[PDB]
Design a protein around this nucleic acid. Structure first.
Ligand SMILES: [Mg+2]
Ligand SMILES: [Mg+2]
Ligand SMILES: [Mg+2]
Ligand SMILES: [Mg+2]
Ligand SMILES: [Mg+2]
Ligand SMILES: [Mg+2]
Ligand SMILES: [Mg+2]
Ligand SMILES: [Mg+2]
Ligand SMILES: [Mg+2]
Ligand SMILES: [Mg+2]
Ligand SMILES: [Mg+2]
Ligand SMILES: [Mg+2]
Ligand SMILES: [Mg+2]
Ligand SMILES: [Mg+2]
Ligand SMILES: [Mg+2]
Ligand SMILES: [Mg+2]
Ligand SMILES: [Mg+2]
Ligand SMILES: [Mg+2]
Ligand SMILES: [Mg+2]
Ligand SMILES: [Mg+2]
Ligand SMILES: [Mg+2]
Ligand SMILES: [Mg+2]
Ligand SMILES: [Mg+2]
Ligand SMILES: [Mg+2]
Ligand SMILES: [Mg+2]
Ligand SMILES: [Mg+2]
Ligand SMILES: [Mg+2]
Ligand SMILES: [Mg+2]
Ligand SMILES: [Mg+2]
Ligand SMILES: [Mg+2]
Ligand SMILES: [Mg+2]
Ligand SMILES: [Mg+2]
Ligand SMILES: [Mg+2]
Ligand SMILES: [Mg+2]
Ligand SMILES: [Mg+2]
Ligand SMILES: [Mg+2]
Ligand SMILES: [Mg+2]
Ligand SMILES: [Mg+2]
Ligand SMILES: [Mg+2]
Lengths: 149, 64, 204
RNA sequence: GGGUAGGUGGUAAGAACCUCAGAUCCGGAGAUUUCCGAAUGGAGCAAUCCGGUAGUUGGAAACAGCUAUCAUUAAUUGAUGAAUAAAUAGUCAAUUAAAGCAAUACGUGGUGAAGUGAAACAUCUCAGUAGCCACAGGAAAAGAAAACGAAUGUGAUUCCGUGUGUAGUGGCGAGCGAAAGCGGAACAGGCCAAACUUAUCAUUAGAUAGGGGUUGUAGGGCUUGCAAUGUGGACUUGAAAA
RNA sequence: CCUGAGUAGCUCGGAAAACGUUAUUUUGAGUGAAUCUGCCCAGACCAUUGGGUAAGCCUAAAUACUAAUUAGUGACCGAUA
RNA sequence: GGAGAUGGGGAGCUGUAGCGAAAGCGAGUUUUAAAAGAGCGUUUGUUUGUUAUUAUAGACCCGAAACGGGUUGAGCUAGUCAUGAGCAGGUUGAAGGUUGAGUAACAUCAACUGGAGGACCGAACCGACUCUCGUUGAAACGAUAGCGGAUGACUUGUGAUU
RNA sequence: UGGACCUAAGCUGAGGCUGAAAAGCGUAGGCGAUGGACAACAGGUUAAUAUUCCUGUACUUACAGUUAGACUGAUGGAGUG
RNA sequence: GGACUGUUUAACUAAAACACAACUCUAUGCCAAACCGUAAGGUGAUGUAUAUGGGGUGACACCUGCCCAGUGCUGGAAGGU
RNA sequence: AUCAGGACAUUAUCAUGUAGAGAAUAGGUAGGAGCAAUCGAUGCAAGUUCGCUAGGACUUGUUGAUGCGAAAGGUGGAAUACUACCCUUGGUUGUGUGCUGUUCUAAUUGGUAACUGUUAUCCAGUUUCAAGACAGUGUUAGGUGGGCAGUUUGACUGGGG
RNA sequence: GGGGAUGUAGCUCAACUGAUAGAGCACCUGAUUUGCACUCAGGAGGUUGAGGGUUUGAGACCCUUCAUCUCCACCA
C-alpha cells in the first residue's frame, strides 16, 4: 500500500515520494522511526494539495532538530560514575536507557529511536563517544567521562 | 475467554461433516493476535484482537 | 463479562465502526419521533389517489373512528337499492355520540362519546352504554336526570345554539329530528364522493 | 372513614378486665419491625462469634451503656502518585446504580443429547425437543422493502382460516413440508451519518457543542422566489369533570 | 456536492430456509469493489424489461401465559375419588 | 348473540370432461405414418348425524435388561497428605569399638564392651487358615475351639483430599 | 474444654490468568487442630452440679493513682521456640 | 511351586496369584520426556542422566542358542506415486 | 529488511546445426538481381568451436584493391548478390515471492536476571538476556490413530455349533 | 469414465525425428585348458503390436484399434 516517507532511506525514495511497501517494514519500522507517514489528508489528491504545506512542515521539524542538536552540543555534561571494584573490574553497567534517565525530561529528549549508538553502549573508564542521528545528514558526537564514585 | 476485546465477536460453533455425512461438533476460533496501538496520548497497550480488527486497525491510520 | 470499560474501547478507536453506531452523542428525539408521525397527507403526481386517501383520514377523524369500523359501515350500506349517495350520509351521521354532540349537551364530540360510554344516555325502545349504535332518523334521546343533578349546565346553552336538522329543547333534556342533514350541514371540511368509489375497490 | 352493643384469636369452660367521651370488627393511610438469609464491618459449622471509626453519658482509666457509619463491582468527579523527567499504572475520597428472589406459566439468545422410528443401521428422524446457562418484560420477539412476484398487480410487522398434505424436498426410504394469492383481527411510521454552515479546542481536528437532512414516480445540500402560520402525535406539566 | 467499505461480492469449511446446502440469508479463515449513465433483486448465468434503495437507530395494536385478587359456572370428584 | 341455537361472512372445498410426462387437444384424447388397432373416457351430486375400520399422536392395559442429560455421595471402604497415640513380658546377641596375641607392617585369632535385625516366643492389638453350630439366625457374615503377624511394607484416632 | 492468641495438610481468595455460558486456577489477605503458647490446689456440701458452689491457702493479666530507679527502644533484623 | 518378610477378591476361592529387593530394554539435555485439563495451572521436581517415565523378567549361582523372510521401530541418498 | 543460490519455475538474444549430392557442416523457408566496393573490398595478424582436422565460422586490426564461383560454375526437397522471417541449442540479463544456506531487528516468544505497583513466588508495567520472522495460535488439507465412540457380524437345520 | 505413455532378435533393450534396423543376453561354429568352467571372435536369431491415411521419402508423422502400465475419478 501507498506510503510517503520522511527522511532519506537507502532504498525506495529520497525525501518526498510515494512507495508501495509491505506493511511489515512500514507499520513496524518506517512509521515508529519517523521515516515515513500514512495517507496524507486521507487520500492521494488530498496529499497533492497538502504537499505545499508538507514541504514547510519538513523544513521546520528539521529546523527544530537543528535546535535539538545545539542544546546537546552546548552542555556535554552527562556524567556518571560507577560503583565497582574499580581496579580489575571496569565496565559500564548502565546499559543504554539509564543514560536516557538523564536526557528525556532533564534535557534534550534524545529518543530511543534517535540515538544510533552501538550495542556496547560504552564499557570504559575514560572519555567515550556517543553518536546520535536527528536526521540523515546530522551526526552528533558526545564525550561522557567515567570513573569511580 | 477466547474473544476479541475491541469487538465482542467470539467463537462460531458448527458441524464437522465428513464423507458419509457423519456429524461431529467442532469449533471455529477467531484469530486472536497480539497488537499494540496508540490511544490517549499514544499509550501503547497490548490487546489480543482478531486479524479482522487488525486489518481494520491498519487501514484506519491508528496503527500509524 | 469483565472490565469492559466502555471508555477504554470507545476512546481506543474514536471512529472505527462500533463507536459511531453507539456514539453516546445519541440525542433524545423523544418528540420528533411522535409528532411528525401523528398523521400526514397531501396529493401526489403518479397515483392520483392521494387526494382520495387524505380525505378519508379527515372524514374518519371528524368522528373519531378506527378504519376497521368504517369498513363495516360501508359494507352494510353498499348493498341495498341503488345510487345510495343519500343513504351513507345518514348512516355516518347516525352515531349516537355524534347526535349527542350535535344535540348540544357536550363541549366536544369526543367528550360526548365519553359521556355516552359512562352511562349518561337514555334512549327510547332501549337504553345505551356503547357509543357506536346506529340510530334511526326519527328517534328520541331523553337525557338522564343524574346528569342535571351534576349542574355543569354550561352544556344546555350549546344545545340551543344547535344546527337546523336537530330539534332539541333546552333544560327539558329531550331530542329528536327529521329531514336528515342535507349537504349544507355537512360543511366543506369533507364534501366529496370519490373516496366512496375507492371503498368499493378496497372493500367488496 | 364505615359501623355498632358487645369484646378480650381455635381446641375453651372458668378467673380477671375492657366497652355508649362510642369498644371489638371492616376499609384507606401510617408507626414499630429481633437474628439468619442478595447479607454487604471481619469471620463462620445460618439464625453464632469477634470488631474498627465518629459522637454522647457514667468511671480515676481500663471499661461499660446509647446512637450513626464501615462489603464488592461499574460510571463520574477530585486529591495523591512508581519503575522514569513528564505522564500513566496504582492508591484514596465523594456521588450515583448493580447485586438476590419468584409465577412447577409465557419471551429472546447461547449450548444442546439420547430412548425411539426407519421393523437391523451409519445418511435421516427423534429435534433444534429434554437439559444447562444468560437477560428481561409485563408481555417479549419482529418490523416500514437494496420486498413479493408476473401483472394496466400488492405496498411495515404480528396472529387466525384456506391455499394442501399442493409445488417441492427425502439411503427419493422412514419421513419432512412451505413461499405467493385470497378471506379476517389490528394497523403507524418515524429518526440519525454524510453533504452545507456556526462557535471553540498549541485549531496540525481527523474533536466538542449548534442550525440543515432522512430519500426511490430518486431524495437532500448550493443559489433564487411564491405560499404558510396552520394540523397532528407513540408527547411535559398543571386545572376541571366523568 | 452528499446518500452508511474490511461493507457488498469472491474462495475454503459450516449452517437458515419445506430443502439433506443452493438462486436468497448468515459466518470461522483469506481476499476484496462502484458511487444515480451508480448498486441489489425477479432459483445457475448472460442481455432486454421491470422492481427496490443494503452495509444506522426506535416503534403501540391485534399475539403468548396465569402464581395472585373479585364475582361466577360445571350432564367435573365426593374420602381407594 | 346468554361461555347459546343462530344471523352475517362464498375465502374456499367437492361435483359439473376427459386424455396425455408435458406444451396441448377436447366427447374426445394418448401411442403411431394411421383416423386402422389398443389404453382411458363418452356421467351420476353435495353437506351433515350414527356405526365399523384405518392414519398421526403413549393409542387396550401391565412388564424390561437398557440409553442420554443433570445433581447427591471418600462419615463404610481404596489411596495420599497433616497432626497425635499404641505395641504386657521374655530371649538370640550383628556391625562397630577397646585390650592382648600375632604380622617387617597387614591379614587373622582370643577376651570385653555395644545392642542391630522388614530377628525369635508370646498377651493387648491387627488379620481371618480349619472343624462344628447357625442358615425365616443373637447377627443382611457371627459364636466356641484352634490359627498368622505382633518394632514394622505395623496398628490406630482426628482433619483434609481424589 | 474451645473462641477473644498462633499456624500444618487443606479451603476461601480482591486484583489477575484461563475458559461458549455456568465457571476453573491462583497472588496479597482470611480461615482451618488432630499441634504450639497461657494463671488453682486440698477438703466439704445437695436427691440430682462442682479444679465452677463453700472453707482454707494461691497464682495470672490489664487500668488508674502513688513511691523509687532507669532513656524508651518495633509492624522490622537476629536467637530461642 | 513360590527365594524370603509381606498384599489380594468387605460377605464361598489367601494361593503356585500380586508385590518385593535385583536384571535388562526403551524414551528423556530441562519451558526435559510422560501425565490431569479445553486451557490457564500443576505433578514429574524446588529433582538434572549415578535423574525421571514406560515395557518385560523376578533372590543367589551358571547360562540365555539360530532366524531381520512378515510385522513393529530407527535411519536413508536420490528415484516413482 | 535482506545476501546469494537454487525452488514457485525456467526467463529475453543471434550465432549454431553434414542425409548424401553439392568447390558448401545447407537445420529453414520463401522472397528477392546483379551485388562488395570511404553505404572503402581484399588478405593475413590473431580469439574460438571444431574436426568428415575438413568444415562452422568468424571477430578485430592488417589495409588499399582485391572483389562476390554461395551473383554467375555448382548440386541439391533444401542455394546461391540482396530482403525478410523460421527454429533446438552456446551466448544475452532474470530468478518477484516463498524457500535453500545465510545475516539484521522492529513483529512476536520466554517457566533468564533486575526494579516498581508491593510488607506480594501470581499478575501488570519498564528494562536486560536468550530467541526471532522461526516458534506458538487460527483456518484449510493429507498421514498415523480401538486412545475413544456408534453399530454390524443372515437363514434352513429331526436342539445348537 | 477418461488422460498420458509404452510395444523393435527368443529375452533384455537402442528406437536408425523419412531419405532404406542395431547392441548385451538365449542358441550354432571357431579358437580356448590335463578336465570343468572362464575368456575372446564370427555366424545365426528382426517381417519393427496390427490395420488404415498422406509425401518423391514414416518401424519413425497422422487416424484407428489390440495388449500393458501409471494416474485420476469411481454414493446404483
Ligand atoms: Mg444424529
Ligand atoms: Mg373511629
Ligand atoms: Mg439413533
Ligand atoms: Mg430402529
Ligand atoms: Mg420490542
Ligand atoms: Mg448475490
Ligand atoms: Mg435444516
Ligand atoms: Mg436507478
Ligand atoms: Mg443507500
Ligand atoms: Mg385422599
Ligand atoms: Mg379409606
Ligand atoms: Mg355460522
Ligand atoms: Mg377408440
Ligand atoms: Mg342425498
Ligand atoms: Mg482413608
Ligand atoms: Mg534388641
Ligand atoms: Mg519380626
Ligand atoms: Mg484461628
Ligand atoms: Mg487441640
Ligand atoms: Mg453425678
Ligand atoms: Mg511366597
Ligand atoms: Mg506370609
Ligand atoms: Mg471372600
Ligand atoms: Mg477366606
Ligand atoms: Mg502446559
Ligand atoms: Mg517443583
Ligand atoms: Mg525411581
Ligand atoms: Mg513374572
Ligand atoms: Mg520364573
Ligand atoms: Mg531388512
Ligand atoms: Mg521408517
Ligand atoms: Mg509458570
Ligand atoms: Mg509463523
Ligand atoms: Mg486432519
Ligand atoms: Mg478404528
Ligand atoms: Mg468399539
Ligand atoms: Mg441406536
Ligand atoms: Mg437358526
Ligand atoms: Mg443339528
Amino acid at each position: 500500500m501507498k506510503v510517503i516517507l520522511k527522511q532519506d532511506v537507502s532504498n525506495l525514495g529520497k525525501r518526498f515520494d510515494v512507495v508501495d511497501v509491505k506493511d511489515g517494514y512500514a507499520i513496524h519500522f518506517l512509521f515508529p522511526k519517523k521515516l515515513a507517514a500514512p495517507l496524507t489528508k486521507k487520500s492521494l489528491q488530498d496529499r497533492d494539495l497538502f504537499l505545499k504545506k508538507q514541504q514547510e512542515h519538513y523544513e521546520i521539524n528539521k529546523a527544530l532538530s537543528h535546535k535539538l542538536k545545539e542544546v546537546i552540543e552546548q552542555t556535554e555534561l552527562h556524567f556518571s560514575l560507577k560503583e565497582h571494584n574499580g581496579r580489575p573490574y571496569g565496565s559500564i553497567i548502565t546499559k543504554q536507557i539509564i543514560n536516557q534517565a538523564h536526557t528525556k525530561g532533564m534535557a534534550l529528549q534524545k529518543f530511543m529511536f534517535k540515538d544510533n549508538v552501538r550495542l556496547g553502549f560504552g564499557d570504559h573508564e575514560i572519555t567515550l563517544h556517543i553518536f546520535e542521528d536527528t536526521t540523515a545528514v546530522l551526526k552528533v558526537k558526545v564525550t561522557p567521562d567515567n570513573g569511580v564514585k | 475467554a477466547k474473544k476479541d476485546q475491541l469487538t465482542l465477536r467470539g467463537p462460531l460453533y458448527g458441524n464437522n461433516r465428513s464423507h458419509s455425512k457423519t456429524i461431529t461438533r467442532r469449533k471455529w476460533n477467531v484469530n486472536l493476535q497480539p497488537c499494540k496501538v496508540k490511544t490517549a496520548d499514544g499509550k501503547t497497550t497490548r490487546i489480543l484482537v482478531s486479524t479482522r480488527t487488525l486489518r481494520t486497525l491498519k487501514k484506519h491510520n491508528r496503527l500509524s | 463479562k469483565y472490565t469492559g470499560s466502555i471508555f477504554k474501547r470507545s476512546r481506543r478507536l474514536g471512529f472505527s465502526l462500533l463507536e459511531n453506531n453507539k456514539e453516546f452523542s445519541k440525542g433524545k428525539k423523544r418528540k420528533t419521533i411522535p409528532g411528525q408521525h401523528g398523521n400526514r397527507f397531501r396529493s401526489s403526481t403518479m397515483s392520483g389517489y392521494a387526494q382520495q386517501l387524505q380525505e378519508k383520514q379527515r372524514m374518519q377523524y371528524m368522528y373519531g373512528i378506527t378504519d376497521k369500523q368504517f369498513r363495516r359501515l360501508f359494507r352494510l350500506v353498499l348493498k341495498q337499492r341503488g345510487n345510495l349517495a343519500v343513504n351513507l350520509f345518514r348512516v355516518l351521521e347516525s352515531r349516537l355520540d355524534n347526535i349527542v354532540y350535535r344535540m348540544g349537551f357536550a363541549p366536544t364530540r369526543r367528550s360526548a362519546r365519553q359521556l355516552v360510554n359512562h352511562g349518561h344516555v337514555l334512549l327510547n325502545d332501549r337504553t345505551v352504554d356503547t357509543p357506536s349504535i346506529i340510530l334511526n332518523p326519527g328517534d328520541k334521546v331523553r337525557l338522564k336526570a343524574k346528569t342535571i343533578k351534576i349542574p355543569i349546565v354550561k352544556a344546555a346553552s350549546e344545545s340551543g345554539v344547535v344546527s337546523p336538522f336537530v330539534e332539541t329543547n333546552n333544560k327539558t333534556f329531550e331530542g329528536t329530528y327529521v329531514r336528515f342533514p342535507e349537504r349544507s350541514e355537512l360543511p366543506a371540511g369533507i364534501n366529496e364522493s370519490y373516496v366512496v368509489e375507492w371503498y368499493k375497490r378496497l372493500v367488496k
